[PDB]
Ligand binder design. Structure first.
Ligand code: GTP
Ligand code: GDP
Ligand code: MG
Lengths: 280, 432, 100, 55, 430
């Protein structure tokens, strides 16, 4: 008179009752796990693959006489976060075109995901390879991360497409090769922004990064975001100018100031640091 | 010069049309893609497009698109005319009222336009063939609407119905007696010749002879196809005694009200034991009249015989046919009616039967297809009337008819119409 | 050489192929219809189109282009110069492009 | 505390679910099979007795 | 193409539909990302039946999620396959029902039903040829049994022509989960006989019995429970999604199973159900199927189907089978069960065939029947209602929301009338 469900029960190891069914269920569960390991769809293999491809090694190119020139691999760092920018390809932005988010991260170790290349946007009168202030270029991702080239771009603010947290202008790594890649350097201080045009850009200095189609500066905040690679902040485009208004139009009419010279200070948020390699 | 137009309405009509036209396209040597390899005997069923392929003279009707688009994806997507596969949007759902009183008109007009176009090209149209299942809502309803529409569009033109009635006990639906009675009421005054095509009797034939425990509907469709081919080969193949379809309503119809009959075929054999048997003309004639060989669940021993049209194909001998007929008449257990001294109509064709690869039948040199009209056919009508009225007594399943737009009275007129038909059959059977 | 393929002719061809897919089935569809041929013949599942594959797709979708015009449009479409077209990129160009 | 190996226990030690119809299943049975009578009979021409034959 | 739209309210129907959509996505080869990676072309001709097509090449289920509280819906959006549903089909209240039928049907239900009615409308004119409606809910709770049935009445009002079926999780007297089922259970079942064209019943107690006796699984949860009910869900609509030798739509099943307008309550069963031991040990054959699918202990409600006579029955075979074996099995089981079947109608059994077996299976059978054994459940329901109504227990929170004893009395009388007219056919003779 073998009867099941007899109040207290032991493991399937004992023979009290209903042990065969439990043991067979356990066997078939690991046999399904055998199927999952036979066909390469393991979540563990996926996470390990992503982690290993994200954290590969890389060499930063050395800088001679501290002058940035096209083709080097350099680090881009927000000073206000004191942190280096990286890209998350695996996360997909909400858009018909394929674009991937970029976030700033405190850890500064040289990684493949954290490295970038500088490329000449369009042929220019400057034949020499030294980069200059106010010269358009395109930032490209390392060929190791993706065989296809990926460029950092932005498109004008729309209520249809606003940042998930910051709600402001987006920055996206996309396959677009259009004019949106046009990025330009700018020297930090208000007094000399205009006159620093046409001068070589040297590494290690506090610089500003501005988009051409929008004339917006790229910057970051203490804005929280979550992804695979720990906890990371946001990078976007916005004008963090000082709030007080100045009579630029009336200064124009009187004739004291001309538009190209700026008059409004911008906060420390907007600063960015180019980082080269320590040793050759 | 001579053509016959085929109509396939209802799901069963569709699945029998597929098999029949596969059989005909193989036996005519035309590929499924539609053009003759080239490495006037087709004008009856196929029509030249002018250069290359051949255009079907067939029409397909159904209210549910699964079978139609399945055929459109099948091997004959390159064969069939595009919009002669007329498909609806909503299935009639086994309801005669749905197919006859609400949504049948949105499709019957298109079908009549199509048949105008097909008949206009044809110059020597011989008649119409109709394929449908009685125990299906859309089948019965659309077959009805088509029959009264063509009855006033043409009139005297001949039509033959290879129709599938529900089996006595082997049937799928519960409400099939209703639409069966209504379909019979619709067709008994509009169909020149109608044959029985129930399924379980032929299932028994297959189990007995082919020795199979597991056949399906495909074999049924194939064998019905072979019967149709045997019947229609006389119009397109040379023979010593050619019989036209017009010699059906003049030889198998003693009275206008009696036009229901049943078919049979011989020999049925597999490829394993065919070479070890005789298969003589006398034997295939004797087996054709064997009571269990009937394709319909009807016992000929319980009624008299009126007229049999039996046709041979192959290298048959008229003298041997006459000898077999003499032996049949000599046998006592088959008895004819007194007022019909001669009741055999024989035709001879020289084309041997075709064999489809992958089918059950083997290659044979002689074959006979027989169509018999007998007074014993009233048994199926009586049993269907019982299955009707037992559940008809207390207004069962009636409101899905009446609230659809059907009037409640028509079942009555069907009842006394079938009663008068049965009285006609049992009055004819008496001796004079 | 008889002639080189001209930009306005390229625009005409792309407009024709761009309009042809609209006529079939419904408005929201034609994306699944284009994807479905790629599923039908992309055996390796890698996601890369080729010259002959695109020729086949055009032949299926009632568009017999010249070999030369097909090479011209292929070259215009690809900048990688690898002789392979990403299916999603081709779909985005043909279907979602504000510019003619 | 388990974190990574917690996948193993949730997968094999009574997670509050059941795994993808594998209780309903039938040596290896995913074997999603499909073929309709028309799609098999009249086109590739396999013998009607040789169809069915459940396995 | 004769597409059907899904609606579900309350956490019960939410779970049922969530797992049903997982089953359908698995069957059709749709990833939780909504992108198709099937193997056949045969999975794609009938995608429009359940999935609409959106930008990016993805598909969206045409389902509506309604509730008076957001907890279970936030759970389902976080669960697997939660990304298939559009964010617009979630509708939720901030109050909840609290197992109060009046709250879910009169005060909060009426004011909230406008949005859900609007969305179901726009989706309904979204489709070309609408086929019907299916609803999944539990009558033992507040929000479901109230708001769902109010939507039932409204939709039946604006669409008198279409067909509508509901899947009702009813309270079992043995397994008790709340103190006040009978009141709102009777209130809901009253409003079902007049509007629902099809209603089929599921019971937690008997479904537990299935899980613990047939499957013999040591510690079942709600997951495999919902898996069984979802398998039953999907087994009925196979012909509308796949080719078969005998197609049969929901209207055909209705007109072929229901004799009278007020007998539209149904009992369902699924086969082959087996324990985790004998999968490779028992041969899958039509005789074994037909034997198991008429086992009384295979049904999902406490009602014993041996205690009455079957009015109509239907079996929907899936997979490649010969038609004869089905036919003779049906007729033989009809003949040796003459005393257990009604006599005045002959051949009260439907056989339907679809040629696509389920995932991981070679054959399957879904049984739907209408029997005089279902009314025993309403005897328990009526006895409980009368006993707890005689002392006027818990009546006053209902009546403090615009209710009075008139509707309770009329619902009780109507349900007893239904029981009477359903039982008088049991002993009827022609
Ligand atoms: N001989 C034969 N009969 C068939 C076939 N298919 C269906 N039937 C018969 O048709 C009856 C049911 O009607 P169906 O043909 O299936 O369907 P319908 O006639 O289109 O009517 P609806 O079901 O309302 O769509 C069954 O009882 C069968 O006897 C077939 O392929 N061959
Ligand atoms: N099958 C099944 N039954 C459930 C589920 N959740 C709840 N139930 C049943 O529903 C009953 C309670 O219903 P309730 O939550 O009050 O319904 P509501 O008030 O409309 O939300 C319990 O007796 C359970 O048996 C589920 O996920 N699956
Ligand atoms: Mg049909």
């Amino acid at each position: 008179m073998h009867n099941y469900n007899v109040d207290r029960k032991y493991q399937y190891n004992c023979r009290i009752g209903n042990w065969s069914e439990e043991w067979e269920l356990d066997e078939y569960k690991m046999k399904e796990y055998l199927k999952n390991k036979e066909k390469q769809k393991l979540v563990s293999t996926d996470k390990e693959d992503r982690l290993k491809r994200s954290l590969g090694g890389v060499n930063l190119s050395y800088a001679n006489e501290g002058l940035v020139k096209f083709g080097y691999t350099v680090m881009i760092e927000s000073d206000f976060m004191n942190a280096v920018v990286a890209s998350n390809i695996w996360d997909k932005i909400t858009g018909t075109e394929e674009a991937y988010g970029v976030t700033v991260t405190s850890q500064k170790e040289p990684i493949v995901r954290t490295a970038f290349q500088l490329l000449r946007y369009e042929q220019d009168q400057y034949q020499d390879d030294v980069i200059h202030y106010g010269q358009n270029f395109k930032i490209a991702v390392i060929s190791r991360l993706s065989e296809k080239p990926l460029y950092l771009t932005s498109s004008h603010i729309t209520p249809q497409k606003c940042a998930k947290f910051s709600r402001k202008q987006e920055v996206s790594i996309s396959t677009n090769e259009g004019i949106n890649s046009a990025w330009c350097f700018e020297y930090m201080d208000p007094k000399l922004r205009y006159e620093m045009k046409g001068q070589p850009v040297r590494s290690g200095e506090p610089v500003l990064i501005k988009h051409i189609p929008t004339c917006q500066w790229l910057a970051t905040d203490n804005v929280q975001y979550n992804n695979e690679f720990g906890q990371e902040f946001e990078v976007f485009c916005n004008s963090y100018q000082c709030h007080n208004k100045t009579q630029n139009l009336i200064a124009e009419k009187v004739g004291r100031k001309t538009i190209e010279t700026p008059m409004r200070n911008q906060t420390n948020q907007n600063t960015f640091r180019i980082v080269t390699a320590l040793y050759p | 010069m001579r053509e016959v137009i085929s109509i396939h309405v209802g799901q069963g009509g569709i699945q029998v049309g597929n098999a029949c036209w596969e059989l005909f396209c193989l036996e005519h040597g035309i590929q499924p893609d539609g053009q003759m390899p080239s490495d006037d005997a087709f004008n009856t069923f196929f029509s030249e497009t002018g250069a290359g392929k051949h255009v079907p003279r067939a029409v397909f009707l159904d209210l549910e698109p699964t079978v139609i688009d399945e055929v459109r994806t099948g091997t004959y997507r390159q064969l069939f005319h595009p919009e002669q596969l007329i498909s609806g949007k909503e299935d009639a759902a086994n309801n005669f009222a749905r197919g006859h009183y609400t949504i049948g008109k949105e499709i019957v007009d298109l079908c009549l336009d199509r048949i105008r176009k097909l008949a206009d090209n044809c110059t020597g149209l011989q008649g119409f063939l109709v394929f449908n299942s009685v125990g299906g809502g859309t089948g019965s309803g659309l077959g009805s609407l088509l029959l009264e529409r063509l009855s006033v569009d043409y009139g005297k033109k001949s039509k033959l119905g290879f129709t599938i009635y529900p089996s006595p006990q082997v049937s799928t639906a519960v409400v099939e007696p209703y639409n069966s009675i209504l379909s019979t009421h619709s067709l008994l005054e509009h169909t020149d010749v109608a044959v029985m095509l129930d399924n379980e009797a032929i299932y028994d034939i297959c189990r007995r002879n082919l020795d199979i425990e597991r056949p399906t509907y495909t074999n049924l469709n194939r064998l019905i196809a072979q019967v149709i081919s045997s019947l229609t080969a006389s119009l397109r193949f040379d023979g010593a005694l050619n019989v036209d379809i017009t010699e059906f309503q003049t030889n198998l119809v003693p009275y206008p009200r009696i036009h229901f009959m049943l078919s049979s075929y011989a020999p049925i054999i597999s490829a394993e034991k065919a070479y070890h048997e005789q298969l003589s003309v006398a034997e295939i004639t004797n087996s054709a009249f064997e009571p269990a060989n009937m394709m319909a669940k009807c016992d000929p021993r319980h009624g008299k015989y009126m007229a049999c049209s039996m046709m041979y194909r192959g290298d048959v001998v008229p003298k041997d046919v006459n000898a077999s007929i003499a032996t049949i008449k000599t046998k006592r257990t088959i008895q004819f009616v007194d007022w019909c001294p001669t009741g055999f109509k024989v035709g001879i064709n020289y084309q041997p039967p075709t064999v489809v690869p992958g089918g059950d039948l083997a290659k044979v040199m002689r074959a006979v297809c027989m169509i018999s009209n007998s007074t014993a056919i009233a048994e199926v009508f009586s049993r269907l009337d019982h299955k009707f009225d037992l559940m008809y007594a207390k207004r069962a399943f009636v409101h899905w008819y009446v609230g659809e737009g059907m009037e409640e009275g028509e079942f009555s007129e069907a009842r006394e119409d079938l009663a008068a038909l049965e009285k006609d059959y049992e009055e004819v059977g008496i001796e004079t | 050489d008889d002639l080189a393929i001209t930009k306005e002719e390229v625009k005409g061809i792309v407009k024709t192929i761009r309009q042809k897919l609209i006529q079939k089935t419904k408005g929201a569809n034609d994306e699944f219809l284009l994807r479905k041929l790629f599923k039908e013949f992309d055996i390796s599942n890698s996601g890369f189109l080729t010259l002959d594959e695109m020729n086949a797709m055009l032949i299926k979708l009632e568009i017999p282009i010249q070999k030369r015009y097909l090479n011209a449009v292929f070259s215009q479409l690809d900048r990688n110069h690898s002789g392979v077209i990403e299916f999603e990129e081709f779909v985005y160009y043909i279907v979602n492009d504000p510019y003619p | 505390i388990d974190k990574e190996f917690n996948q193993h226990v949730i997968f094999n030690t009574q997670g509050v679910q059941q795994h993808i119809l594998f209780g309903h299943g039938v040596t290896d049975y995913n074997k999603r099979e499909y073929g309709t009578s028309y799609d098999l009979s009249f086109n590739q021409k396999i013998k009607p007795q040789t169809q069915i034959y459940s396995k | 193409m004769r597409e059907i739209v899904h609606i579900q309210g309350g956490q019960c129907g939410n779970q049922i539909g969530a797992k049903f959509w997982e089953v359908i996505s698995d069957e059709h080869g749709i990833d939780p990302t909504g992108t198709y990676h099937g193997d056949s072309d045969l999975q794609l001709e009938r995608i429009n039946v359940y999935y609409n097509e959106a930008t990016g090449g993805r598909y969206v289920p045409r389902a509506i999620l309604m509730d008076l509280e957001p907890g279970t819906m936030d759970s389902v959006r976080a669960g697997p396959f939660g990304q298939l549903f559009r964010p617009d089909n979630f509708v939720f209240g901030q109050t909840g029902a609290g197992n109060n039928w009046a709250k879910g049907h009169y005060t909060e239900g009426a004011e909230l039903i406008d949005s859900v009615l609007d969305v179901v409308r726009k989706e309904a004119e979204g489709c070309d040829c609408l086929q019907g409606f299916q609803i999944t809910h539990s009558l033992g709770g507040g929000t479901g049994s109230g708001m769902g049935t109010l939507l039932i009445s409204k939709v039946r009002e604006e669409y008198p022509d279409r067909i509508m079926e509901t899947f009702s999780v009813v309270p079992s007297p043995k397994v008790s989960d709340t103190v006040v089922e009978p009141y709102n259970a009777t209130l809901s079942v009253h409003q079902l006989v007049e509007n629902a064209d099809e209603c089929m019943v599921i019971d937690n107690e008997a479904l537990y019995d299935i899980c613990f006796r047939t499957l013999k699984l040591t510690t079942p949860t709600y997951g495999d429970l919902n898996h069984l009910v979802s398998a039953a869900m999907s087994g009925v609509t196979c012909c509308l999604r796949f080719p078969g030798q005998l197609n049969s739509d929901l209207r055909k099943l209705a007109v072929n199973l229901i004799p009278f307008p007020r007998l539209h309550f149904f009992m369902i069963g699924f086969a082959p159900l087996t324990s985790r031991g004998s999968q490779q040990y028992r041969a899958l054959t039509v005789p074994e199927l037909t034997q198991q699918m008429f086992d009384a202990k295979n049904m999902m409600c406490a009602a014993d189907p041996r205690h009455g006579r079957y009015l109509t029955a239907s079996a929907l075979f899936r997979g490649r089978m010969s038609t004869k074996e089905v036919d003779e099995q049906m007729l033989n089981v009809q003949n040796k069960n003459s005393s257990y079947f009604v006599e005045w109608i002959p051949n009260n059994i439907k056989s339907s065939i679809c040629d696509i077996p389920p995932k991981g299976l070679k054959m399957a059978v879904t049984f739907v029947g209408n029997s005089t054994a279902i009314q025993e459940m309403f005897k328990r329901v009526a006895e409980q209602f009368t006993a707890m109504f005689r002392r006027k227990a818990f009546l006053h929170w209902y009546t403090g929301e615009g209710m009075d004893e008139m509707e309770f009395t009329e619902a009780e009388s109507n349900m007893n009338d239904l029981v009477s007219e359903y039982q008088q056919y049991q002993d009827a003779t022609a």
